[PDB]
Amino acid sequence: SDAVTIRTRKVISNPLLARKQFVVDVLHPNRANVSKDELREKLAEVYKAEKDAVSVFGFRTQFGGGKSVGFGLVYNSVAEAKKFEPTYRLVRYGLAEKVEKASRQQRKQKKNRDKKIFGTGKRLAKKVARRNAD
Amino acid sequence: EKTHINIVVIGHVDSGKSTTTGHLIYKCGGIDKRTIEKFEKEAAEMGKGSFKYAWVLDKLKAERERGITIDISLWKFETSKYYVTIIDAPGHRDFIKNMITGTSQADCAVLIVAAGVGEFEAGISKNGQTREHALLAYTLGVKQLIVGVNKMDSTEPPYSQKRYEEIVKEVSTYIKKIGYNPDTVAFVPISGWNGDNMLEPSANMPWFKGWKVTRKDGNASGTTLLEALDCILPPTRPTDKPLRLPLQDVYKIGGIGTVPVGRVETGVLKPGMVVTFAPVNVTTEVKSVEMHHEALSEALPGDNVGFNVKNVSVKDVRRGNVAGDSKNDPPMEAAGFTAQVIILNHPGQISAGYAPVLDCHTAHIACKFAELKEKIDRRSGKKLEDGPKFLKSGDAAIVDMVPGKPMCVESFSDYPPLGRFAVRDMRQTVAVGVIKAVDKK
Amino acid sequence: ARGPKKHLKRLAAPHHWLLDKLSGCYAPRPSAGPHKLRESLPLIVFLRNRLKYALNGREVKAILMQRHVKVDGKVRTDTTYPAGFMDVITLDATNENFRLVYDVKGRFAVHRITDEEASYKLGKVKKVQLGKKGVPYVVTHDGRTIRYPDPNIKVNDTVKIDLASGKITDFIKFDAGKLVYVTGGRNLGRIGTIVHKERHDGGFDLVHIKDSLDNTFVTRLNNVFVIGEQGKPYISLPKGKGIKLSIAEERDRRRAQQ
Amino acid sequence: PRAPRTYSKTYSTPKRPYESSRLDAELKLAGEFGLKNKKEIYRISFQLSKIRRAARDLLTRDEKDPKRLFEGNALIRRLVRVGVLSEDKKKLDYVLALKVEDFLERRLQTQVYKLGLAKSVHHARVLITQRHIAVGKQIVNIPSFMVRLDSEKHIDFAPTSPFGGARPGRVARRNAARKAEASG
RNA sequence: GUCUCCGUAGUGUAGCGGUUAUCACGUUCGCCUAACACGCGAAAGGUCCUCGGUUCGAAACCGGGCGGAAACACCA
RNA sequence: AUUCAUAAUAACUUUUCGAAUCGCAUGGCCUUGUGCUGGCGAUGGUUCAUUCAAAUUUCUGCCCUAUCAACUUUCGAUGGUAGGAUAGUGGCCUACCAUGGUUUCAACGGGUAACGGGGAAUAAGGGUUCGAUUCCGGAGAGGGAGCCUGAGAAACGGCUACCACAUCCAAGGAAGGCAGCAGGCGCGCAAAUUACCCAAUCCUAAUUCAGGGAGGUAGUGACAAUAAAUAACGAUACAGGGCCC
RNA sequence: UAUCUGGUUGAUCCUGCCAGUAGUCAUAUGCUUGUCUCAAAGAUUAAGCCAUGCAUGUCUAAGUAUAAGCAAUUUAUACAGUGAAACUGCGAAUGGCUCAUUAAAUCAGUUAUCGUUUAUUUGAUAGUUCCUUUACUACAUGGUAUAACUGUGGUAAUUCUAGA
């Protein structure tokens, strides 16, 4: 939080992926860590971009305290960020919402149950209902 | 949504307990027609055609051959108001301990009384069980009950009135002496074998206007037995207390480990929970829980739930233990305990070293009275004498007693269902009491 | 076992891929293609661990699906395409053309070539036969089939494939005084000149290739690749040019660089 | 099916575990250098045996041998780097003449004592394990660090330590707050 | 879990509702040596498994509990 | 090194292939018309080569036993001829003919608390023991046999039959092979949760999107390994080691 | 880190064995147990038997739709957007588990296929198929169902199936 001094290293350029990769070295003297939103904010103006155009992960704090090493990415456009950044990091900051597809267990059971019927099942449902009405 | 209650059933031999129970289960969606028709065929080959309804609960070979309910048996049926399961009591002085095990895990009670000429007089006699079974119900914690006058066709005249009014008058005089208010108790005339006045109103007996009850909570007035089962009050379930479920049975189920089964007297049992059985001292984890072939997440108090243990064995586990959460205060072995007991007539005198088969909850064991502390008044715990020399019938007393065999017990203040007990000696109920203090091991 | 195998555990993969042994238990098995699986390089490992352009497996898939790389003129879309020796990957973006040439140490390299050099690819022919309808053809090391070749072209020579048109434009005969490139074996990646050879008409022809520093070594004829005459390489040689310095000379080179 | 990790034992138990002469020797060494477990002496002897075995295998080969020369100087360079061998003893024969005390002297515990910041080797151990001492710009809490004649000038109090300035500390605050409130 | 056959000194194990004792081994005790040893000369050793009654009176008459010795059972 | 690749003759086919498939952008010539030409692709297709492979095969090498010294050939054993079958060579099989083939240089038969190897423990050297177990090559889906589909199976999380097991039965009948991931009984000295995710490493499909108990993560875990708390530092009461008076 | 010791005898020197000693990716068990990293784990006896729940299905710009499914075409009169199910084309013979059988057998190093098959890929590769081949025939193009679906259903049950 004090004297963050975000220094970037190993900067590279990828017109292939429309992104620039760099191992971001951040020092946090007398402070524990720097929050992910913190480095992303000042990552915008050093690369002359916006907040919602950068991506950083890692940040394993060096033993003893006062240093942290992480790897960061910057994307040129919002649409480029959507089409390249993975969904887990998208929902992470503010970029999208993770919809709960129930869980793996019920989906597998539903798939097997749907596999046990040959067709839509509307005729099967009405046939079993008529036969088992009594 | 529908609540859940638990009933037990009681009565004299050949009063029509299992016939009334089984046929009531059949009417309320228990079993389909081909199952009971099979039972009619097999019992006709045996020779006991009348017992086809009794066979539904009496499943054992020795029970069906003899035509005798030896051990208790469970069976469910959904009434109009809520869920309920029955305890089929033996109704014998031979198997009186099995009745005490069944009635101890029951909230309400269905006192079946014979109406036929001669059988009622034999039932309510010195040797009969109608006096005993009603007394044993109030002893173990069955506060509310229902009386059912059975065999109206057999009695003379069948479905008359007088005979019914004579039985209700005779029971009302005795049942007041036990503790039950006969105003609050419902008296229903029925026929178990015929299937009369149980589900629907009877055509054979229009004279019967209708039973009625006068409680503090709410009044009820029904025509049939089924409506009287709906009018039973929801009991007070102590969910907040530490678990104190004395086990009922321990099965080794196919493809799902060891499965301990028992009613949650107190607390909430659930899957993935370590438990400790009290006398044997065996710690183990439960795999899963069930109640009448249906799985459960939360086993609430007063339920026929059944956990399943794991990482151990069926012999380490046993009928009688208390799965007090190995995390919460578990049930410990009792070396000696302060358990007052009042007596209900011991032909012999009660002094010391006398080990009757203390049947606290579901467990029966001989207990020797180390000594007698104080002769106490019949009520309010009033101290009358210091250090008595002997005790007689019709007298209360605090007594410290050492079990002859490892037993688990607990105080009445902590656990009301656990604290109840009776005493038996010379094939008769000599005393009845409650435990206030207990020394752990 | 009851058919082919489509898997590669991350312990039987070729060691020149420079793959680790902790990131997963499997390896990117190359699909069937021009080169063998043990003598080529999948596009996934080349872009993820060599160029470091892509981090994860899906990033390589996204780059490949976006029609960016061009291997031997063809764009290609398979993540496990077996790109081996004499394979040129052209990237329209970043303005770099990459050529797969072995290094002195025994792995692949990231040698950068000009756009003119990427227009032609050298190829060592393996078989010359008279095919159906009487048409002659040659079989290069990459498996390319070129019809109606030069009659002077025989077995164990090298041709200059035009790549863009797929036509032979120049052929280099195999004789003494020819700069070659060893492909495969414990002596792979060495560049030297041929002095003589013992024919040994029982298989496994041997050729005595001599380095520019008077170092001589023996390599089977199946592992050689003529890349030009003496002193003039038809291809831009990688850095070092296969000097093959010893462990002592390498250590002094490091101490003279730090 | 992942590749298994490699593990190795770094100590060798003595063949004769029951001998007064050897028993007193390690007790003297452990007490002088401030060591709790004699496995630490077992460990440091195990490393000595390995390098002696490697150096012995080198001495059975002729001079101007590419294998003997390359590994010989590499082992010699490592030893003189870590400071167990002096500059004038780089001849591959004194390597066989190394003792346990020479290796033990290079431990960070002894160097902290030698530079004069602990006043006792046992106080060096508590200083090591309480994170009051750092190497360069990194806090090290391992007693065995084996400084290599280049970080010896970088041994100093950590910036995040009460002894070397910084925030006063835990028990001091409780005492300071107690006396401040008592006087207030 | 239900049903059946037995329970008796220390090992053996008799024996028999008005009352439990015997028998060998053993268990000790005086005997000698130095400790012995054999040789010897004498006597210490059971709520009749537990409780409850029947009982003038029971361990044995009866029933309950336990122990052991045998069975059949025991899908939340 | 070929009766090799290949070409041409005379025929054989009941006849193989030689595009009736699909998506975008829709452009030019004029004899001004649903006239005539025209791109970037996907799918499929006969043959060759290549690649991922598959199946045979040359040489050498495996534990203990002679209280196993002869083995094989009835009814296949050795070799030859010719033919069937195979995707191919071949007693693989068949018909005929010859009587061969192996063996103290350890055949054959028996036991194996015997899958083999890369390797592991142990030590100066030599060597001994172990190796089911993360990788490679093999066998099996309870014990055998048979077969369809497909390039590839003699497949069992594919079927057919028998035997030993075993489930649902309103007694006619139907449905199964956990030595897959968890979990249950039994066995024993002896060995874990009936959890989460395709986020990584990969594989498969028409394919960037989907699926994968392959796999990864967490939980139980003192199988084995690495480092390392449980204590240190001043002042006072005694007891010292050089030395000053 | 190329090391020994105790025990036959009144005592000595030997042979000789027993015991001691240290290690084990050799297990099992006992007592105790505070921390970080890494991590084996139903093989040994039973390749003994399994309740239950999962473990392989799959599409693009581009095989087939009028879902009597969902939004809007308004660039589209035949759809041409998204798209369940089904047909079709592939995969399901990979992976995973176990070590029962097996002692020139498997397997390891090393050769051959001039003695064979080879999906999928990669690079190439069909001016010649109207057969009295002039009416014998659509080639700005042929024929036939069938699934899904609509409705009738049967059996107690099955990933059971019929008729229209």
Q: Which helix (H) or strand (E) holds D20?
A: helix D20-33
Are chains C and D touching, using the cut-off of 8 Å on CB pairs and a minimum of 3 such pairs? yes
Q: Edge-to-edge, what's the strand order for the sheet holding C87-91? A: C69-71, C87-91, C96-100, C112-113
Nucleotide G1's nearest residue (CA vs C1') is D49
**C111 and C13, same structural domain?**
yes
**C86 and C17, same structural domain?**
yes
Q: Look up the domain containing A62 and give its range.
A: 1-134
C-beta separation of B269 from B323 below 8 A:
yes
- CA-to-CA distance for A51 and A59, rounded, in angstroms? 18
Give, as one character, the DSSP assignment of residue D95. G
Residue D152 domain flag: yes
Give, as one character, the DSSP assignment of residue C50. I
**Tokens representing A103?**
């869980």
B151 labeled binding residue: yes
Residue with tokens 């070129």: C146
Rounded to a whole number, what is the distance in Å from the CA of C194 to chain D's nearest CA? 28
Number of domains in chain A: 1
CB C248 to CB D66 under 8 A? yes
- Output the DSSP codes for B137-163: HHHHT--S-EEEEE-TTTSSSTT-SHH
Q: Look up the domain containing D170 and give its range.
A: 17-184
D160 to chain A: which residues are within 8 Å by CB? 30, 64-66
Residue D4 domain flag: no
With contact defined as 3+ CB pairs under 8 Å, the chains touching B are none
Q: Is residue C63 helix, strand or coil? A: helix
Give, as one character, the DSSP assignment of residue B69. -
C-beta separation of B271 from B289 below 8 A:
yes
C-beta separation of C225 from C121 below 8 A:
no
- CA-to-CA distance for C166 and B251, rounded, in angstroms? 79
**C214 and C160, same structural domain?**
no
**C150 and C98, same structural domain?**
no
Residue with tokens 């409680």: B215
Instruction: Identify the residue among C48, C56, C59 best suited for mutation to test binding to A, counting A beta carbons within 10 A and taking the highest.
Output: C59
Number of domains in chain C: 3
The residues that bridge with B391 in the sheet, in sequence order, are B350
The residues that bridge with D155 in the sheet, in sequence order, are D135
Closest CA to B417 of B235, B261, B280: B235
- CA-to-CA distance for B409 and B428, rounded, in angstroms? 22
- Which method, experimentally, gave rise to this model? cryo-EM
C-beta separation of C125 from C140 below 8 A:
yes
Question: Among C79, C95, C116, which residue terminates a domain?
Answer: C116
Residues with Cβ < 8 Å from C118, sequence gap 6 or more? C88, C90, C97, C99, C163
Residue D5 domain flag: no
Residues with Cβ < 8 Å from D4, sequence gap 6 or more? none
C-beta separation of B376 from B341 below 8 A:
no
**C7 and C59, same structural domain?**
yes
Q: Which helix (H) or strand (E) holds C193?
A: strand C191-198
Long-range contacts of D77-81 (CB under 8 A, 24+ apart): D79/D51, D81/D148, D81/D149, D81/D150
* Nearest chain C residue (CA) to A16: C93
Residue C253 domain flag: no
B411 labeled binding residue: no
CB C21 to CB D66 under 8 A? no
Q: Look up the domain containing C132 and give its range.
A: 121-171
B149 labeled binding residue: no
Long-range contacts of C204-210 (CB under 8 A, 24+ apart): C207/C180, C209/C180, C209/C182
Other CB atoms within a 10 A radius of the CB of residue D8 amount to 4
* Nearest chain C residue (CA) to D3: C21
Instruction: Identify the residue among C245, C251, C255 best suited for mutation to test binding to D, counting D beta carbons within 10 A and taking the highest.
Output: C251
Residue C214 domain flag: yes
Number of domains in chain D: 1
B405 labeled binding residue: no
Answer whether A118 touches D (CB < 8 Å). no
**C2 and C110, same structural domain?**
yes
Rounded to a whole number, what is the distance in Å from the CA of D162 to chain A's nearest CA? 13
Q: Which helix (H) or strand (E) holds B417?
A: helix B416-419
- CA-to-CA distance for B425 and B430, rounded, in angstroms? 6
Are chains A and D touching, using the cut-off of 8 Å on CB pairs and a minimum of 3 such pairs? yes
Answer whether D28 touches A (CB < 8 Å). no
Burial of B417 (0-12, 13-18, 19+ CB in 10 A): buried
User: Which of residues 191 through 220 in chain C touch D, CB cutoff 8 A?
Assistant: none
* Nearest chain D residue (CA) to C247: D70
With contact defined as 3+ CB pairs under 8 Å, the chains touching A are C, D
Residue D34 domain flag: yes
What does R_g of chain D's alpha carbons equal in angstroms? 22
Residue D57 domain flag: yes
**C7 and C110, same structural domain?**
yes
**C100 and C154, same structural domain?**
no
The Å distance, CA of B266 to C1' of G138, is 89
Residue D128 domain flag: yes
Instruction: Identify the residue among C55, C61, C75 best suited for mutation to test binding to A, counting A beta carbons within 10 A and taking the highest.
Output: C55
Residue with tokens 């030698």: D114
